[PDB]
Amino acid sequence: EVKYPAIFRDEGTYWDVRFPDVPAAQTFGASVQVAADNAANALAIALFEQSLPPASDPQYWRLASTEFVVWITMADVQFGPGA
Template sequence: MEHEMEVKYPAIFRDEGTYWDVRFPDVPAAQTFGASVPIAADNAANALAIALFEQPRPVASNPQYWRLASTEFVVWITMANVQFGPGTDTPEPMN
């Protein structure tokens, strides 16, 4: 069964010096990283899609009151018209 939906969750990007760590407080299984912010954002979208595959979607938090370290910032990762289920294409792995 296919399900089309918009997926939107806040992600915390943290500068680790040589790479950017990304985590989703609402979807703990969706953790990733990248050598730059754009690569980390692409990886974050893929990690989110994989973590939510055939899983109930948790409610997205409002990051307005989150306390972040000076090396962190929040990005909303949004994917429109996402299709989950048999017969849909599997995302390509990111390097």
């Protein structure tokens, strides 16, 4: 399981999700859980055929009052033999 720390940001009517370690995995969702579901897929997209960067330790981050961290597991769906 490949996990990265996401910053969830309250935009009032939706949640913005970004990964400092994986900038191309930026997404959003109407609720925290939908945003999290989306974030798992966004990580898979962004890390396709890429080397995997280290995960940052979020304890060193300075966050806004609108922001909190969720660890997101990268989606990894396989359909063929040997999954």
